[PDB]
Amino acid sequence: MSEAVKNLVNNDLADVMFNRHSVRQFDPNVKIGRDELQKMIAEAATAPSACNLQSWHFVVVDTPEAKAKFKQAVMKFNYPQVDSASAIVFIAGDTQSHYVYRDVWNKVYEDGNITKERLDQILGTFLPLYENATPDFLKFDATIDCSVVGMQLLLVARAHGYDANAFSGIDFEKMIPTLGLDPKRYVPVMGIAIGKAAQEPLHTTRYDAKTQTDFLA
């Protein structure tokens, strides 16, 4: 069908966004390949981010063993989503994303896409704020980036014909180590559970019973 290859099988914006609902029970018989998961994550990461630092990090949970480990830091209220989802994409904030600030915006200049003067405005203005920032503010900054990419991922999920639930009902003191992520670096934000919505039970047919009946003579 046409709207793929825009690679979006539901490319109707109004339907995708305005008929979006949190789905918490998915069809456990449908699995999403990791290649399509990577595709959806890349599509979501077209999202904006402060100073284009893209301060998000994704951890994909899609095996029974990964789920059992993941659930250690997830509130039991949210076990239905985790158990039934094809995959959970957990989003953590990168509070060291500004370490590459100067190099990154220099690359834009070296590519001839901004003037030297423009580059100097960008470096002069925002880099010192990142460099002198408190932990709380870096966490705040990273949390915003993670939320806008999470929002896009919820839409991307539907554009691929799936559905999804965003959730932050987690153990915030345990999630980062549970994911094996650098606690110095990463802050937990939200999980995105993804899969096919749980459907209505199949209504089966019957042969006409006259076919399976004899009257004895």
Ligand X SMILES: CCCCCCCCC(=O)CCCCCCCCC(=O)O
Ligand Y SMILES: Cc1cc2nc3c(=O)[nH]c(=O)nc-3n(C[C@H](O)[C@H](O)[C@H](O)COP(=O)(O)O)c2cc1C
Treating both helix axes as pointing N-terminal to C-terminal, what angle do 101-110 and 116-131 enclose, rounded to 10 degrees? 170
d(CA 90, CA 164): 12
Tokens (6 digits) for 58: 């994704």
Of 99, 98, 117, 97, the residue nearest 109 (C-alpha): 117
Question: Regarding beta strands 163-167 and 56-61, do their DSSP bridges make them parallel or antiparallel, or are they unpaired?
Answer: unpaired
Tokens (6 digits) for 31: 């699995």
Return the number of the residue (77 or 199) whose C-beta is nearest a copy of itself: 77
- By a kind-dependent CB cut-off of 5 to 8 A, residue 165 interacts, out of Cl ion, ligand Y, ligand X, none, with ligand Y
For ligand Y, the binding residues in 25-44 under the rule CB under 6 A are: none
Judge whether 45 and 54 are in contact, CB under 8 Å. Answer: yes
For a copy of itself, the binding residues in 153-182 under the rule CB under 8 A are: 154-156, 159, 166, 168-169
Region near ligand Y per CB under 6 A, out of 4-12, 19-27, 197-205, 208-216: 19-27
Tokens (6 digits) for 28: 């456990």
Instruction: Give the chain's largest Cα–Cα span.
Output: 103
Determine if 61 is a binding residue for ligand X (CB under 6 A): no
Question: Is 24 annotated as ligand-binding?
Answer: yes
Return the number of the residue (63 or 169) whose C-beta is nearest a copy of itself: 169
Determine if 38 is a binding residue for a copy of itself (CB under 8 A): no
| Sheet with strand 56-61: strands edge to edge | 56-61, 87-94, 186-195, 163-167
| Minimum CB distance to ligand X, residue 90 (Å) | 14
Residue of 49, 55, 152, 178 interacting with ligand Y (CB under 6 A): 49
What residues make contact with ligand X under the rule CB under 6 A?
A: 24, 50-51, 114, 118, 122, 126, 129-130, 133, 141, 168-170
- As annotated, the binding site includes 20, 22, 24, 49, 78, 81, 168-169, 206
Q: Given the rule CB under 6 A, which residues bind ligand Y?
A: 21-22, 24, 48-52, 78, 144-145, 148, 165-169, 190
